[PDB]
Amino acid sequence: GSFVEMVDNLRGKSGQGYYVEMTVGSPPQTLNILVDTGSSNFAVGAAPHPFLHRYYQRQLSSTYRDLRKGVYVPYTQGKWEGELGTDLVSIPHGPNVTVRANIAAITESDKFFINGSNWEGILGLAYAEIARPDDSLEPFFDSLVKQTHVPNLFSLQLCGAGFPLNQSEVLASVGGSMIIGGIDHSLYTGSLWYTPIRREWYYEVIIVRVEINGQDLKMDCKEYNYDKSIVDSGTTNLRLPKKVFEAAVKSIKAASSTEKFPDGFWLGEQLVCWQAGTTPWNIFPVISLYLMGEVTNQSFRITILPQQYLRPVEDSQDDCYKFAISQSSTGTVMGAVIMEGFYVVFDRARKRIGFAVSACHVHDEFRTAAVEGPFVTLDMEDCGYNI
């Protein structure tokens, strides 16, 4: 329905992440927490760091409980180490409840805290299977549902500004909404279409067809989900498996061939700039991803514009962007630049993910993002990867 207390509770941008305010401990300690559907731990800075202006001070919380257990989390681009404990946690612009949750108090980290991101921790919203050190460490959302009457569902509206925001603007701007326990109908237009959650670990989905400006990429659909396809608010880009990325970039280059861009642009490293207001959106194609539907032999599609996959960056008065589609060796990742086009419903109770056109997606007068269906699609189970 309508969840006015949670609408507009996020801040941030696709490159540095979107965060929500939370409180930990007694008396409450306020922290800004990255919303991450790609992990399953609630972890906060708990020791001084050059990039943190605040951190969780366990010795100041009367409700802190030490679990006497460490946690070591090395991942591809970064790492953190911490100490496990529990404490009382609330979301000020959330459900009006306080829960006793696991907290990994980060004591040492490497390339984890981003200089100027304004967040001091991460809220992993995925399932216990991928929690560290193991699946016995109950994730925050699991604790919230178990301890309260909050429905087992959350929804995210990530709002890209469509232009760069400076330090002051990003602190003053509304970055979106995280609706805990419901769906807010003001955040989207048109209908919600649902795709099954294939397995509960990451938010895993199955892509069944890919088009670039209506042209079928024509790859065996297993390639699109090799070795998985996930929905991840903690990733900036749309990341595609190597072979899919190679085919997609060739097609996007062919569609936009009236302008030549350097190799560094297509590699997502180099910015491209145009005179203020002259970005040639129309030369860039739309991209549609078809997802397995809830009905047998039915699919639907989500369509994004270059306003989603060209990420605004500061250079001058030029309008500059980076290409936000990149290669992956760990499957497809529908990151923030996909999520900015849509209101995304993580319906854990019904093991499904819903998509609708976002009320805050960036577009022009000629084209809009879309969520459409149904389409007849056969052998969709064959699109999923095994082993």
Ligand SMILES: CCOc1nc(N2C[C@H]3C(=O)N(C)C(=N)N[C@@]3(c3ccc(C#N)s3)C2)nc(C)c1F
């Ligand atoms: C395989 C590692 O499993 C785990 N992975 C993770 N994460 C991997 C990181 C990552 O690379 N992506 C993309 C992501 N979605 N989340 C992480 C981010 C770090 C900084 C971000 C920003 N901005 S987002 C957190 N945490 C735990 C606790 C794991 F167990």
